[PDB]
Amino acid sequence: EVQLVESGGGLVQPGGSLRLSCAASGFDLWYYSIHWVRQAPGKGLEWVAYIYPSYGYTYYADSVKGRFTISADTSKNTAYLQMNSLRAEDTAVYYCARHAWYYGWGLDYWGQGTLVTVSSASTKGPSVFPLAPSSKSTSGGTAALGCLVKDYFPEPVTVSWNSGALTSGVHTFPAVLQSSGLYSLSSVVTVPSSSLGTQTYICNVNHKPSNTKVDKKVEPK
């Protein structure tokens, strides 16, 4: 029943602030430990900080000392990491975890990952162009179709298919920071050629950082 739920991710220009939130369900935080570990893009793990509510322990990492502050509110069963003078290097996805003694010195049930980006660049809503399943792209019984999400900033972008139902054989590729400075990705799905246009095909893109919602239809060329 134990769950940790995070939010607060977004973009902040160097020098700004943001509070991350890690709420807990099915287990009291007071008699436990909440830690924050940040993962820089393509880099290793980094323990940011910890709080030990019923113990009165708040120790922070050396990189974040003074700039960041961990805290916890027992009633909401929720810890908060208020980061206040964010520099570029701090850009990372931040996870929160519980440290229980039955599992020793160790972080059991982890968060999901809440992304924080430190850049002075500006948010751009995405544009979505279809990747039509051309008869040439048809590999016999196996047909290829997809969506192209171009020129969006900052991360992240979520791309479901057909309101979640169509999942088998979908390959949402990672994003690339195009040299222009905008993000770009491409999600494809091997669909039966027999399905052709008989089965409807709509990709659902969401850019929560820009509050943009685009559900584009893919149809034969």
Partner: peptide, 10 residues
């Protein structure tokens, strides 16, 4: 059990 362990751990 997890609660007993934690509240009575060292």
């Amino acid at each position: 059990f997890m609660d007993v362990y934690q509240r009575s751990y060292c």
